[PDB]
Amino acid sequence: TGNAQKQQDINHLLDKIYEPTKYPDLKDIAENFNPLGDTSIYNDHGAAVETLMKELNDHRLLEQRHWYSLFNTRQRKEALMLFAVLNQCKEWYCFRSNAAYFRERMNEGEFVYALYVSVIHSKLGDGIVLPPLYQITPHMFTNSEVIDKAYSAKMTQKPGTFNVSFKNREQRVAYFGEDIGMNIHHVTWHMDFPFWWEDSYGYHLDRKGELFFWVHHQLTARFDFERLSNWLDPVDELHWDRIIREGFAPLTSYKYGGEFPVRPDNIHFEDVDGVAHVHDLEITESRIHEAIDHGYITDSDGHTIDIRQPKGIELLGDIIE
Amino acid sequence: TGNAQKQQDINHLLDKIYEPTKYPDLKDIAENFNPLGDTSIYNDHGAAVETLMKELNDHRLLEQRHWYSLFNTRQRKEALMLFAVLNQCKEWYCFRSNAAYFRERMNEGEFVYALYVSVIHSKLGDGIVLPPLYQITPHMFTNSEVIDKAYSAKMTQKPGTFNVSFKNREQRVAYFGEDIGMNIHHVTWHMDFPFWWEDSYGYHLDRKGELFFWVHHQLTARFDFERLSNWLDPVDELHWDRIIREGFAPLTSYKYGGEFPVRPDNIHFEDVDGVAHVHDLEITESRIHEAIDHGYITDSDGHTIDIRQPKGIELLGDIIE
Ligand SMILES: [Cu+2]
Ligand SMILES: [Cu+2]
C-alpha cells in the first residue's frame, strides 16, 4: 500500500488513456495476470471477475476507441462490471492487477468511468485524489477549436497554450454552464451518489433523493441568478407538448465518435426509437404528479406508501430520477 | 332428423336470401306456425320467443331489405334474439319452424347472422356444413363491378362468369386482405368465439382472451410478412393524435344500402356522433395501459385483480376487445 503508491498507480493508469500503456509494469501485468487464478483476493470468490471474463471472452463487451455514454443501458452494465471487480478486491495487488488487465482490453469510457467510481466508493481507495477529468479526457471539457489547435501543435511538435472562446443570444450566461468546475461537480455529484447504486455494493447512500431534489434545485437556482445578472428572464419550464424554443450548437467533439449533434431552434419533440415515446413521458409525468397529488406513492402490489411526511421528498426523488 | 335433412333445410333457408322463400314447406310453415302455442318445445318455456314476438309485434325490429352491421347495438340485439330462440329448441321441428317463421319477417342480415351463429353453437346443429357466405350474400365479398356485371347478366338472361380485379400503392399486398378465404376465417373466428357470449347460452368458450390476442397477432404477423415480400415496410401502428396517413376507397357495395364510403388520405380523426369521442378512446387507451403497468386490472368494486400470472393475457383480452 502507501498512497503515494496507490496514487502513483492511479496516475499511471489514467495516463495517455487513449493508448496502450507505456508503463512497463502495467503491461507485464496486463499480459501475465489472470483474474481467475486465486479466487481469494476477491470477497466474492470472484463471481464478478468470472462474469466480466465471460463477456470479455465471448467478446461481447464494447470495443475500444469508440464512444460511450453512461445512458446506454449496455455500455453502463459493462462499465459497471469493472466496478464490481475492482470493488471486491481485498487489497491493492488485486486492484492494480485488474485496472491494468482490463484497462488494456476494455473500452476507455467504461474504463475511466469504472476506475473513478471504484476509487470513490471502494473501501480500498482512501489515500487517493483523482486527476481532473478535464485533463484526463479533454474532448469532453474542451472546445472543438482548441482541440484541433492541439492536434496541429502535435502534428508539428511545436508546443503552447490556446485561448478558448465560449452578442446574438443567451450564450451570455454561458460562462456558467461551460465552466470546467461546474462540469466537474455535476459529474462528481452523480459519481458520489449514482442512480445505479444497489446497497449490495456495500453501504447505503443516505438521502440520495433529497440530495437529488436539492442539488438540481440549486443548479437551477444558481442558473436563474446568472440570467438575472444578464438582463435575462428566469427560465422557461420545458413541456412535451410544446416546441423546444432555444436550441444550440455545441461546437464540441468526441475523441472517437465525431462532433456532438446540433439542434435547430423552434423544433418539435420527436419520438426517439430505442429510448422511448414522447407520450411515454407525458404519462410518466402523470403517474408522478398523481402520487404528489394523492398523498401516496403506490408500489407493485398496490400498497400505498405514504409521502405526506418527512421521508416524503426522497421517496419522491427515488421515483423521479 | 338425418342431417342430410338437417342440411337440406339449412341450404333451403339461406337460398335466395333477398326474397321470400320459394320452398313451399318453408312457406306454409312461415304462415301457419305460431311460435308461442306449445311452449313445451322450448327449454325456457318460450321466454326466448315471447320476446322476439313482442318486438316483432310492436313492430320495432329492423326492417327487411335494409343494411345491418354487427356493430349496431340494436341491430345486434335483435339478431341476437333469433339466436336465443333457435338456441332453445329441443329438436329440429322447432328450428325449422322458427328459422322459417322468422326468416320471413326479420331483416336478412340479422337472419343470416342469427342462423350461422345458431347453427355453430346450438346443441342441435351437429351434422351441418354452412354454405360459404361469399356465395350466400356476395355483395360483401365481391367487387362492385363484378356485382354490376352480374346484375346485367340477369337483366338480359345471357349468362357468364366475370373476372374480378383487386401500380401506385400498397394495394400490392391486396391479394391478402381481399381473399374470400381470409375473409371467411376472419368472420368465422368471431362466430366461434363471439364478443357477446354470455355463459348463460350454455358452456363457456375457454381462453377467448388469449384466443383473441393471438389470432390478430397472427393476422398482423401474416400481414407484416406479405408486406415484406413486397418491398413494403412493416405497418405503422395507428394513433388517435396523428393523421390517418393511408386511406383507401373500397369500391364495394351493399345489396340494400349503397356504396361503401371511401376515406381520403391524410385525414384527421373526427369525433363520431353516436359512437364516441376521439378522446374517449384516448382515455380507455390509458386506462388499459395502466392495468398493464400496475400489475393489476381493477374491478368495479375497486378490487385489484392481479394479471402478472398465466391467466394474465386473457383477463387482458377480456377488457381489451
Ligand atoms: Cu445531474
Ligand atoms: Cu377481428
Swiss-Prot record, chains A, B:
Report the locations given in the UniProt record.
Secreted, Extracellular space
Q: Please list the tissues where expression of this protein has been recorded.
A: Hemolymph.
- The entry's Cu cation A-binding residues are H186, H190, H216
Disulfide bridges in this chain: C89-C94
Q: Which domain of life is it from?
A: Eukaryota
Q: Which residues are glycosylated?
A: N163
Q: Which residues cross the membrane?
A: none
Q: How does it assemble?
A: Hexamer of a number of different chains, of which A, B, and C have been identified.
Q: What does this protein do?
A: Hemocyanins are copper-containing oxygen carriers occurring freely dissolved in the hemolymph of many mollusks and arthropods.
Q: Which family does it belong to?
A: Belongs to the tyrosinase family. Hemocyanin subfamily.
Fill in the misc note. Answer: The A chain contains two copper-binding sites. Three histidine residues are ligands to each copper ion.
Protein name per UniProt: Hemocyanin A chain
Covered residues of the complete protein?
Answer: 5 to 329 of 657
